[PDB]
Protein backbone atom coordinates (compact mmCIF):
# COMPACT_ATOMS: atom_id res chain seq x y z
CA UNK A 1 0.00 0.00 0.00
CA UNK A 2 3.02 2.20 0.84
CA UNK A 3 4.71 1.43 -2.59
CA UNK A 4 1.74 2.77 -4.56
CA UNK A 5 2.42 6.35 -3.41
CA UNK A 6 6.19 6.02 -3.39
CA UNK A 7 6.00 4.98 -7.05
CA UNK A 8 3.87 8.05 -7.66
CA UNK A 9 6.52 10.28 -6.09
CA UNK A 10 9.30 9.05 -8.45
CA UNK A 11 6.83 9.37 -11.31
CA UNK A 12 5.87 12.91 -10.46
CA UNK A 13 9.69 13.60 -10.25
CA UNK A 14 10.43 12.32 -13.78
CA UNK A 15 7.66 14.25 -15.53
CA UNK A 16 8.12 17.60 -14.02
CA UNK A 17 12.00 17.72 -14.25
CA UNK A 18 11.74 16.77 -17.89
CA UNK A 19 9.19 19.52 -18.54
CA UNK A 20 11.77 21.83 -16.90
CA UNK A 21 14.36 21.02 -19.58
CA UNK A 22 11.85 21.64 -22.28
CA UNK A 23 10.53 25.01 -20.94
CA UNK A 24 13.57 26.44 -19.36
CA UNK A 25 11.45 29.34 -17.96
CA UNK A 26 10.49 28.30 -14.42
CA UNK A 27 8.50 30.11 -11.85
CA UNK A 28 7.86 29.34 -8.08
CA UNK A 29 5.62 26.45 -7.20
CA UNK A 30 3.46 26.09 -4.11
CA UNK A 31 0.50 28.13 -5.70
CA UNK A 32 2.68 31.18 -4.85
CA UNK A 33 2.23 32.83 -8.18
CA UNK A 34 -1.59 32.60 -8.01
CA UNK A 35 -1.82 34.72 -4.88
CA UNK A 36 0.10 37.49 -6.69
CA UNK A 37 -2.31 37.19 -9.75
CA UNK A 38 -5.36 37.35 -7.49
CA UNK A 39 -3.86 40.62 -6.17
CA UNK A 40 -2.82 41.83 -9.69
CA UNK A 41 -6.41 41.17 -11.00
CA UNK A 42 -7.75 42.86 -7.86
CA UNK A 43 -5.76 46.05 -8.68
CA UNK A 44 -7.13 46.04 -12.29
CA UNK A 45 -10.61 45.26 -10.93
CA UNK A 46 -10.44 48.55 -9.18
CA UNK A 47 -9.22 50.47 -12.32
CA UNK A 48 -11.23 48.99 -15.27
CA UNK A 49 -14.92 48.61 -14.66
CA UNK A 50 -18.31 49.88 -15.83
CA UNK A 51 -19.83 46.62 -14.41
CA UNK A 52 -16.71 44.53 -14.94
CA UNK A 53 -15.71 44.70 -11.14
CA UNK A 54 -17.92 41.80 -10.09
CA UNK A 55 -16.54 39.51 -12.86
CA UNK A 56 -12.80 40.39 -12.79
CA UNK A 57 -13.03 39.99 -9.05
CA UNK A 58 -14.63 36.64 -9.57
CA UNK A 59 -11.63 35.56 -11.67
CA UNK A 60 -9.25 36.72 -8.98
CA UNK A 61 -11.10 34.96 -6.09
CA UNK A 62 -11.20 31.85 -8.09
CA UNK A 63 -7.41 31.51 -8.16
CA UNK A 64 -6.95 31.55 -4.42
CA UNK A 65 -9.06 28.42 -3.74
CA UNK A 66 -6.45 26.18 -5.31
CA UNK A 67 -3.69 26.50 -2.56
CA UNK A 68 -6.43 27.37 0.15
CA UNK A 69 -8.13 24.01 -0.28
CA UNK A 70 -4.85 22.13 0.35
CA UNK A 71 -4.60 23.93 3.71
CA UNK A 72 -8.20 23.31 4.50
CA UNK A 73 -8.38 19.50 3.86
Amino acid sequence: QFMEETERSLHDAIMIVRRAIKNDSVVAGGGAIEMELSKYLRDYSRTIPGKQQLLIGAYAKALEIIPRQLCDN
Binding site: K39, R46, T47, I48, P49, G50, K51, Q52, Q53, L54
Partner: protein, 132 residues
Protein backbone atom coordinates in the same frame (compact mmCIF):
# COMPACT_ATOMS: atom_id res chain seq x y z
CA UNK B 1 -23.17 72.76 8.89
CA UNK B 2 -23.63 75.43 11.62
CA UNK B 3 -22.98 73.15 14.58
CA UNK B 4 -20.02 71.31 13.24
CA UNK B 5 -18.10 73.25 10.57
CA UNK B 6 -16.13 70.01 9.94
CA UNK B 7 -18.17 68.26 7.26
CA UNK B 8 -17.28 65.46 4.79
CA UNK B 9 -17.43 65.73 1.00
CA UNK B 10 -19.03 62.57 -0.52
CA UNK B 11 -22.03 60.48 0.49
CA UNK B 12 -21.70 57.24 -1.56
CA UNK B 13 -18.31 58.42 -2.84
CA UNK B 14 -16.86 58.17 0.66
CA UNK B 15 -18.17 54.74 1.23
CA UNK B 16 -16.72 53.44 -2.08
CA UNK B 17 -13.31 55.25 -1.41
CA UNK B 18 -13.38 53.69 1.94
CA UNK B 19 -14.02 50.23 0.49
CA UNK B 20 -10.53 50.09 -1.11
CA UNK B 21 -8.89 51.93 1.79
CA UNK B 22 -10.09 49.13 4.13
CA UNK B 23 -8.91 46.50 1.80
CA UNK B 24 -5.47 48.25 1.42
CA UNK B 25 -5.31 48.02 5.27
CA UNK B 26 -6.49 44.44 4.96
CA UNK B 27 -3.62 43.37 2.64
CA UNK B 28 -1.09 44.82 5.02
CA UNK B 29 -2.55 43.18 8.16
CA UNK B 30 -2.56 39.65 6.73
CA UNK B 31 -3.69 36.59 8.71
CA UNK B 32 -7.27 35.63 9.65
CA UNK B 33 -8.11 39.31 10.03
CA UNK B 34 -7.51 40.23 6.33
CA UNK B 35 -10.84 38.47 5.34
CA UNK B 36 -12.78 40.00 8.18
CA UNK B 37 -11.80 43.51 7.20
CA UNK B 38 -12.63 42.67 3.58
CA UNK B 39 -16.17 41.81 4.41
CA UNK B 40 -16.63 45.06 6.35
CA UNK B 41 -15.58 46.72 3.16
CA UNK B 42 -18.23 44.93 1.04
CA UNK B 43 -20.97 46.28 3.41
CA UNK B 44 -19.87 49.95 2.81
CA UNK B 45 -20.93 49.24 -0.79
CA UNK B 46 -24.69 48.91 0.19
CA UNK B 47 -24.70 52.73 0.44
CA UNK B 48 -24.20 53.22 -3.29
CA UNK B 49 -26.71 50.47 -3.96
CA UNK B 50 -29.49 52.02 -1.78
CA UNK B 51 -29.32 55.36 -3.65
CA UNK B 52 -29.35 53.58 -6.99
CA UNK B 53 -32.58 51.99 -5.89
CA UNK B 54 -34.27 55.26 -5.07
CA UNK B 55 -33.06 56.86 -8.27
CA UNK B 56 -34.21 53.82 -10.33
CA UNK B 57 -30.51 53.40 -11.69
CA UNK B 58 -28.52 50.19 -12.08
CA UNK B 59 -26.87 49.31 -8.72
CA UNK B 60 -23.88 47.17 -9.83
CA UNK B 61 -23.05 49.46 -12.73
CA UNK B 62 -23.24 52.46 -10.40
CA UNK B 63 -20.69 51.37 -7.72
CA UNK B 64 -18.18 50.01 -10.37
CA UNK B 65 -17.78 53.22 -12.17
CA UNK B 66 -17.19 55.25 -8.89
CA UNK B 67 -14.25 52.94 -7.96
CA UNK B 68 -12.94 53.26 -11.48
CA UNK B 69 -12.04 56.97 -10.83
CA UNK B 70 -9.05 56.52 -8.50
CA UNK B 71 -5.49 57.63 -7.79
CA UNK B 72 -4.92 57.38 -3.99
CA UNK B 73 -7.72 57.05 -1.43
CA UNK B 74 -8.92 60.51 -0.62
CA UNK B 75 -12.10 62.23 -1.68
CA UNK B 76 -11.95 65.82 -2.95
CA UNK B 77 -13.65 68.16 -5.58
CA UNK B 78 -10.14 68.49 -7.25
CA UNK B 79 -10.76 65.59 -9.49
CA UNK B 80 -13.94 63.58 -10.26
CA UNK B 81 -12.78 61.67 -13.39
CA UNK B 82 -9.72 60.45 -11.66
CA UNK B 83 -10.86 60.50 -7.99
CA UNK B 84 -14.11 59.82 -6.09
CA UNK B 85 -16.39 62.71 -5.03
CA UNK B 86 -20.23 63.05 -4.70
CA UNK B 87 -23.11 61.37 -6.39
CA UNK B 88 -26.58 62.56 -7.24
CA UNK B 89 -29.95 61.19 -5.91
CA UNK B 90 -31.08 60.79 -9.61
CA UNK B 91 -27.84 59.69 -11.29
CA UNK B 92 -24.66 57.78 -10.51
CA UNK B 93 -22.40 60.44 -11.98
CA UNK B 94 -19.66 61.96 -9.76
CA UNK B 95 -19.90 65.73 -9.14
CA UNK B 96 -17.76 68.46 -7.69
CA UNK B 97 -18.75 70.58 -4.67
CA UNK B 98 -19.27 73.78 -6.59
CA UNK B 99 -21.63 71.56 -8.77
CA UNK B 100 -24.17 69.02 -7.44
CA UNK B 101 -22.29 66.49 -5.29
CA UNK B 102 -23.45 65.19 -1.94
CA UNK B 103 -21.77 65.98 1.36
CA UNK B 104 -22.62 64.59 4.83
CA UNK B 105 -21.65 66.06 8.24
CA UNK B 106 -18.91 64.45 10.22
CA UNK B 107 -21.18 63.54 13.10
CA UNK B 108 -23.87 61.78 11.06
CA UNK B 109 -21.23 59.49 9.42
CA UNK B 110 -19.11 58.53 12.55
CA UNK B 111 -22.15 57.84 14.79
CA UNK B 112 -23.86 55.62 12.07
CA UNK B 113 -20.90 53.32 11.27
CA UNK B 114 -20.27 52.65 14.94
CA UNK B 115 -23.90 52.08 15.97
CA UNK B 116 -24.33 49.59 13.13
CA UNK B 117 -21.18 47.67 14.40
CA UNK B 118 -22.53 47.30 17.99
CA UNK B 119 -25.76 46.04 16.46
CA UNK B 120 -23.93 43.54 14.24
CA UNK B 121 -22.32 41.91 17.11
CA UNK B 122 -25.58 41.47 19.15
CA UNK B 123 -27.71 39.63 16.45
CA UNK B 124 -24.76 37.41 15.43
CA UNK B 125 -24.20 36.30 18.95
CA UNK B 126 -27.23 34.12 19.72
CA UNK B 127 -27.46 30.40 19.26
CA UNK B 128 -30.89 30.01 20.91
CA UNK B 129 -34.42 31.37 21.35
CA UNK B 130 -35.82 27.99 22.30
CA UNK B 131 -37.78 27.11 25.35
CA UNK B 132 -35.30 25.47 27.61
Amino acid sequence: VLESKSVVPGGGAVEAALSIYLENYATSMGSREQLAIAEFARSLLVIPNTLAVNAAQDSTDLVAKLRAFHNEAQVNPERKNLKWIGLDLSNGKPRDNKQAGVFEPTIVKVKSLKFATEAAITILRIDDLIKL
